[PDB]
Paper text:
NXF1 is a modular protein comprised of four domains: an N-terminal RNA recognition motif (RRM), a leucine-rich repeat (LRR), a nuclear transport factor 2-like domain (NTF2L) and an ubiquitin-associated (UBA) domain. NXT1/p15 is a 15-kDa protein that also has an NTF2-like fold and which forms a heterodimer with NXF1 via the NTF2L domain. To do this, type-D retroviruses have a ∼130 nucleotide long RNA element known as the constitutive transport element (CTE) in the 3′ end of their single-stranded RNA genome that binds to NXF1:NXT1 without the need for adapter proteins.
Because the linker between the C-terminal UBA domain and the remainder of NXF1 is thought to be very flexible and the N-terminal 95 residues of NXF1 are thought to have an auto-inhibitory role in mRNA binding, these two regions were deleted to facilitate crystallization and analysis of RNA binding. The asymmetric unit contained two copies of the complex that were arranged to form a domain-swapped dimer. Density for the RRM domain was not observed, probably as a result of its not having a well-defined position as a consequence of the flexibility of the RRM–LRR linker. Strikingly, the position of the LRR domain relative to the NTF2L:NXT1 region was the same in both copies. In addition to the interaction between the pre-α1 loop with the canonical NXT1 copy, the linker between the LRR and NTF2L domain also made contacts with the alternate non-canonical copy of NXT1 in a domain swapped manner (blue on orange). Hydrophobic contacts also dominated this interaction interface, where Ile360, Phe362 and Val364 were buried in a cavity of the non-canonical copy of NXT1. The resultant domain-swapped dimer generates a flat platform with 2-fold symmetry in which the three pairs of RNA-binding domains (RRM, LRR and NTF2L domains) are all arranged on one face that results in their being ideally placed to interact with a dimeric binding motif such as that found in the CTE. Consistent with the requirement that the nucleoporin binding sites of NXF1:NXT1 need to be available while mRNA cargo is bound, the putative nucleoporin binding sites consisting of the residues 486–491 and 519–521 and 527 of NXF1 were found on the opposite face of the NTF2L:NXT1 dimer.
Numbering used by the authors:
A (entry chain D), D (entry chain B): 3 to 140
B (entry chain C): 202 to 424, 427 to 549
C (entry chain A): 203 to 423, 427 to 549
């Protein structure tokens, strides 16, 4: 019904917009960041698991202020078999991050984005998050 | 003029005598008038830069812990010569400059860095110029917002507002598998996968990947220069840096055949499966996602002797015989960090 | 350049072509229309005049329309209809199929309006695109919102909702917390402003504390302003950085306070309209803010009406009495809405 | 022990720093604002009462993003009888504010600030807040 290349292009557009939204929001409006995540979403922050909007919000409130700078980004559309009748995309990012009172560190992070349709409007939510430092051992 | 090295040891002794262990207070009030130095016929003038420098040096070397100092009745016209005091005596929280010849507040700008709880500027010519104590206190507070006491009189509370921003990062964990089932399953799967991947003939992977399986490769930007990453350089995909769509389509591999065909072209590898760090981003009835952080060494070409670090993301839909089938595959490759190189193999 | 009667005929044809249930207006091949041809009326939509006219008609008669069809009319240019956003904002479906448009750029001018469905099938521009991905993105740039293009459903549009809030809490009139403070504070205010309005303010000395401080402020603005009388006494730490002068605008003891208050013009306060907030309550102190309006009776200020915000800190006195330690008065010109509801 | 004019000056400095701190934090990093208020402190926002650090934080979380523009400020030291053995100051501010999705409005606000002394450090907290719009009727 719809071409495959279209999914790739749309996924790219989605990722490049999302990076902007999420990271700008994380830097500027930490409070609102949590609302991007759906409730079912799971977050793995350096091996620490966070589930549910509430825990996500508290966890994000707990973290220091940030100023992310993104080196590289990549994205792929996801097979429908994994999420039947639901449009979804995978995004991976590598960059540098600077937390308050902590030295700057390079980071790798991946997101799973699912499109959610409501009769009035359609919006995308983060179905998963995994963040880790390149050098988390130190 | 300059003082003989022998005189400096004597002065040091005098300072040690004038120092008090219990209170951590070092007194240098009227140092020239000191009977010993006068008896040895040694003349030490503190307003002179040499003697002061010497004194500061002695303080730093001998006593770095001192919290209180007294420089009263030493007739210092200028305070820049001791401006180094911040480094020499960081712990210092109490200073007394009473009875000296300095007429202006400006002299303090050079002594601004150090923080004092208590200060004494009484008896100096500068105190006379100020009409009201409010001006005095404000003028001094600008230099030392922290000090509690001035001229033996406790002061109004210092002006500070604590936003109470956080600075502590969460405790890092090694690997998250959630339920043990996923640990066993995922680890087992990685053993098999990378056992086949390391073999040299990667077509064994075709049983792992789905028919419509997608795969892509990325590397951190190098601002070619024949860098170690230069082999992966031809294949890396970055949507931020590459805006052309028709290429973006192709740098992505749509079907298992093209995926493994592409994977066979990648150099031979040796992976520390033991050292691998696994995170399970999400789990659903329909799919399972996880990330693998590790390092690998290559076995072919000149570049082989180099060690690379990698982060690989996997999405998997369940398959027969408790096996999992990959739908999406993303590989991020960079040269490994020294700390990673050191702990490369056990 | 068409006679009004022809415009009425066109109106009638549009009314015939209009559909109420679906709210769809068909303008397909308007020039070929049998009625207009039979009436000898010639309407060329690609021409700017006729286009302007038809759009104007759309605006005039039916602004509720949600769907339109402009297929097979041979429009080379889309700027002449760029006003469509204003003429028919409610429009959610547009069809331009079978026309002469040569480039995608033509769409930039029709960007404003939001459509769920669009049709560009049959136009010369479709030929340039290699893959439908480029097509869809190219069209989506102008209309990020549309769900359907050329009768074919599209991937979900990509939008992210930060869900920032925009709604403020409902404003409330007056807060006393416990009723005791309402009775006590209100009573205190009745008495205070009863004495304050008298003209002889010496009665106030019993209310203020011995070390009591008082100060005055007005909104930053030049000459002959209604506030200009208070300007001479107003205290602003931001605009005035000099300390010794700042000291002078503050009155340390009750004598200077009431002496200073005697210098303020005579006043009459609408105590009924007063809005009271209790900022804080302690065993040792009680703070509250009084927002209201007052009218003066003497001087240039005469017949003028002022709005005020006054904050009080009070330490308890015997028999539920309050003793003022700090007093701050902020005075400004009243709003029209406040003037209308000034008294009674 | 110490002169009155000194208290006046200190009140001025206190006000001048506090305005910047409070309104800048309210504009940029809403999340941390609450930390300024004492636990005992009470907030009166257009006749709505807020008591306790938690309720204050949630209440501030509920509000739209802000862009305060301050017209005028005034301050006075407070008699010790009101807060024995505790240094405190009263500050009043009038300005304009622009909340997200709401038109700019003029506002009057007053604070009571009490100095809190700990052996390690001394810090000031807000003992009370009252905020109201000039035109709350609309």
């Amino acid at each position: 019904s719809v071409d495959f290349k279209t999914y790739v292009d749309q996924a790219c557009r989605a990722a490049e917009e999302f990076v902007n939204v999420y990271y700008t929001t994380m830097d500027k409006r930490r409070r609102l960041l949590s609302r991007l995540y759906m409730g079912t979403a799971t977050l793995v922050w350096n091996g620490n698991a966070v589930s549910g909007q509430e825990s996500l919000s508290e966890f994000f409130e707990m973290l220091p202020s940030s100023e992310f700078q993104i080196s590289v980004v990549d994205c792929q559309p996801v097979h429908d078999e994994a999420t039947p009748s639901q449009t979804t995309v995978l995004v991976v990012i590598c960059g540098s991050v600077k937390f308050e009172g902590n030295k700057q560190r390079d980071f790798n992070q991946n997101f799973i984005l699912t499109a959610q349709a409501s009769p009035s409007n359609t919006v995308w939510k983060i179905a998963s998050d995994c963040f880790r430092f390149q050098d988390w051992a130190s | 003029n300059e003082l003989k090295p022998e005189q400096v040891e004597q002065l040091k002794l005098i300072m040690s005598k004038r120092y008090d262990g219990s209170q951590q207070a070092l007194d240098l009030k009227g140092l020239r008038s000191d009977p010993d130095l006068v008896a040895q016929n040694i003349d030490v003038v503190l307003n002179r830069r040499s003697c002061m420098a010497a004194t500061l040096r002695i303080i730093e070397e001998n006593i770095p812990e001192l919290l209180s100092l007294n420089l009263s009745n030493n007739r210092l016209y200028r305070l820049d010569d001791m401006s180094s005091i911040v480094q020499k005596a960081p712990n210092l929280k109490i200073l007394n400059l009473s009875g000296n010849e300095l007429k202006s507040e400006r002299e303090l700008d050079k002594i601004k860095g150090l923080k004092l709880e208590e200060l004494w500027l009484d008896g100096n010519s500068l105190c006379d110029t100020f009409r009201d104590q409010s001006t005095y206190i404000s003028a001094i507070r600008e230099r030392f917002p922290k000090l509690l006491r001035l001229d033996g009189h406790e002061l109004p509370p210092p002006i500070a507002f604590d936003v109470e921003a956080p600075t502590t990062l969460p405790p890092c964990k090694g690997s998250y598998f959630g339920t043990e089932n996923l640990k066993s399953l995922v680890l087992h799967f990685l053993q098999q996968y990378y056992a086949i991947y390391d073999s040299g003939d990667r077509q064994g992977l075709l049983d792992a990947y789905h028919d419509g399986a997608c795969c892509s490769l990325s590397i951190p930007f190098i601002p070619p220069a024949r860098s170690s990453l230069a082999e992966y350089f031809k294949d890396s995909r970055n949507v931020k840096k590459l805006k052309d769509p028709t290429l973006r389509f192709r740098l992505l591999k749509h079907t298992r055949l093209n995926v493994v065909a592409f994977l066979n072209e990648l150099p031979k590898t040796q992976h520390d499966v033991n050292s691998f760090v696994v995170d399970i981003s999400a789990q659903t009835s329909t799919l399972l996602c996880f990330s693998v952080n590790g390092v690998f060494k290559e076995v072919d070409g000149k570049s082989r002797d180099s060690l690379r670090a990698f982060t690989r993301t996997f999405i998997a839909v369940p398959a027969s015989n408790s096996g999992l089938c990959i739908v999406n595959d993303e590989l991020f490759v960079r040269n490994a960090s020294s700390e990673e190189i050191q702990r490369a193999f056990a």
